[PDB]
Design an enzyme around this catalytic site. Structure first.
Site, short mmCIF file in Angstrom:
data_model
loop_
_atom_site.label_atom_id
_atom_site.label_comp_id
_atom_site.label_asym_id
_atom_site.label_seq_id
_atom_site.Cartn_x
_atom_site.Cartn_y
_atom_site.Cartn_z
N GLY A 14 44.58 42.33 44.79
CA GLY A 14 43.89 41.51 43.81
C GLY A 14 44.84 40.88 42.80
O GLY A 14 45.90 41.43 42.51
N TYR A 18 45.07 39.85 34.19
CA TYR A 18 45.71 41.18 33.99
C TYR A 18 47.10 41.35 34.62
O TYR A 18 47.93 42.10 34.10
CB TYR A 18 44.77 42.31 34.49
N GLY A 19 47.36 40.65 35.72
CA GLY A 19 48.50 40.91 36.59
C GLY A 19 47.97 40.97 38.01
O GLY A 19 47.12 40.16 38.37
N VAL A 21 47.40 43.73 41.82
CA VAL A 21 47.27 45.05 42.43
C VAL A 21 47.86 44.97 43.80
O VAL A 21 47.55 44.08 44.58
CB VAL A 21 45.81 45.56 42.55
N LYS A 36 48.62 49.02 40.05
CA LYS A 36 48.26 47.90 39.14
C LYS A 36 49.50 47.58 38.32
O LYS A 36 50.05 48.48 37.65
CB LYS A 36 47.10 48.25 38.19
N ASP A 121 31.33 47.20 32.99
CA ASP A 121 31.36 46.09 33.99
C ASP A 121 31.11 46.56 35.43
O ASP A 121 31.92 46.20 36.30
CB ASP A 121 32.68 45.31 33.95
#
Length: 262
Positions: A14, A18-19, A21, A36, A121
């Site tokens: 992914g 955020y960055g 994975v 992550k 979430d």
């Protein structure tokens, strides 16, 4: 043993703001994990919640390394991907599979609420599946403490994903954490059972949410949902979060306890 500290990054799982994975594979053991990778106070909070997690239906945190200003978060890998990709658009999935996922979801949410953590979430992208299709609640980057020293704290931050968010977060200044996660689990269920989301958001302007409040279950997605699970959804997707079914009462629901799956 030399080299057991080393992991090869082999697949992207992914990418976000955020960055990323990455699927990581240990050079010596061939153990597979999820890493992550991020480029401060927020990641600090996230790591702190991640360390508290130890249940079969929540992703496990193995620990973190910092190199420079890059943080690497090692966690449990779920090799079957997300629940999102098991939902067929406009169909959903078979009712026994959906019930089994909903049982595991509830087990993980019970767990989190027990340790005073709200997820905030819950959606099929954040529900991952292992090699045996066991469901793991992922992504703690919006999670927060709602109970500490047996005292509850009310939430006020607007967050989550609109078609999943409970209506009180759109209407009230403050709200209880637990009825919010329960509502989003209801929307998850609807999606598994119907392969579609019932409304853009639960607001008075959204005709699809008004249709629901007026009981028009001869319309989609409701007409695709058998009467037993639809009873349960009538108790979860209740506008007043104080009247909304709690988890202890979901565990007493007829559909929840119906034998379906081999």
């Amino acid at each position: 043993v030399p080299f057991v500290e080393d992991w090869d990054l082999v697949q992207t799982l992914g990418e976000g703001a955020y960055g990323e994975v990455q699927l990581a594979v240990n050079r010596v053991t061939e153990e597979a994990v999820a890493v992550k990778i991020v480029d401060p106070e927020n990641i600090k909070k996230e790591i702190c919640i991640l360390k508290m997690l130890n249940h079969e239906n929540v992703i496990k945190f193995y620990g973190h390394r910092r190199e420079g200003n890059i943080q690497y978060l090692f966690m449990e890998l779920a090799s079957g991907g997300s629940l999102f990709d098991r939902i067929e658009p406009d169909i959903g999935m078979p009712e026994p599979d959906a019930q089994r996922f909903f049982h595991q979801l509830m087990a993980g949410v019970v767990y989190l609420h027990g340790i005073g953590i709200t997820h905030r979430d819950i959606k099929p992208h954040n529900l991952l599946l292992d090699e045996r299709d066991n469901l793991k609640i992922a992504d703690y980057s919006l999670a927060t403490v709602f109970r500490y020293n047996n005292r509850e704290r009310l939430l006020n931050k607007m967050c989550g994903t609109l078609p999943y968010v409970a209506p009180e977060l759109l209407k009230r200044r403050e709200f209880h954490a637990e009825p919010v996660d329960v509502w989003s689990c209801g929307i998850v269920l609807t999606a598994m059972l119907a392969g579609e989301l019932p409304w853009d958001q639960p607001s008075d302007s959204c005709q699809e949410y008004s249709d629901w409040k007026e009981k028009k279950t001869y319309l989609n997605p409701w007409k695709k949902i058998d009467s037993a699970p639809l009873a349960l959804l009538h108790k979860i997707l209740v506008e007043n979060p104080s009247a909304r079914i709690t988890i202890p009462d979901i565990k007493k629901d007829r559909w929840y306890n119906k034998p379906l799956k081999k």
